[PDB]
Design a protein around this nucleic acid. Structure first.
Length: 162
RNA sequence: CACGGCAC
């Protein structure tokens, strides 16, 4: 019963749609996926993005992630946001060696198995008090969701072993 | 900001 959450970085402008008027959208998500979801109310001063923490079973976590991806994609269409919205996962640096693997073998396997392109933020962009690397996943809603499942499997495995 | 909230 691993208790490491999934942490996402989403554009600030899509949070209103994720939560929904009176909280109705996120309330439905957390009910349906049996998840605890915490949306940061203050932007990271890094960029125009807010972090979302999702605590659930691996399956409930993946379902909540996909729901958020679906909501974001629909809002972008609705406001004619033309740019791509990659999935961004934050992961503590202590887990990223295993996600990448020797010679990048593990990350390349996830890219092939899910048809995505995954890039991880550079090690020297960390700060002493922000140890979280940004995992950027470019793909469709469907492939990004599959990538999240595989990515978090390796993160949890690192979490329980490294 | 569509702004919700499951404690120890």
């Amino acid at each position: 019963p691993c208790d490491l959450p999934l942490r996402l970085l989403v554009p600030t402008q899509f949070v209103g749609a994720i939560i929904g008027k009176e909280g109705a959208t996120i309330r439905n998500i957390t009910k349906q996926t049996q998840s605890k979801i915490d949306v940061h109310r203050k932007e990271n001063t890094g960029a125009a993005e807010k972090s979302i923490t999702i605590l659930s079973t691996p399956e409930g976590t993946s379902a909540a992630c996909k729901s958020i991806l679906e909501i974001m994609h629909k809002e972008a269409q609705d406001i004619k946001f033309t740019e791509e919205i990659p999935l961004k996962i934050l992961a503590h640096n202590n887990f990223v060696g295993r996600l990448i693997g020797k010679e990048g073998r593990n990350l390349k396997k996830i890219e092939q198995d899910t048809d995505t392109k995954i890039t991880i933020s550079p090690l020297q962009e960390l700060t002493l008090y922000n140890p979280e690397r940004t995992i950027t996943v470019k793909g469709s809603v469907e492939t990004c969701a599959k990538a999240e499942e595989e990515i978090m499997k390796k993160i949890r495995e690192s979490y329980e072993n490294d």
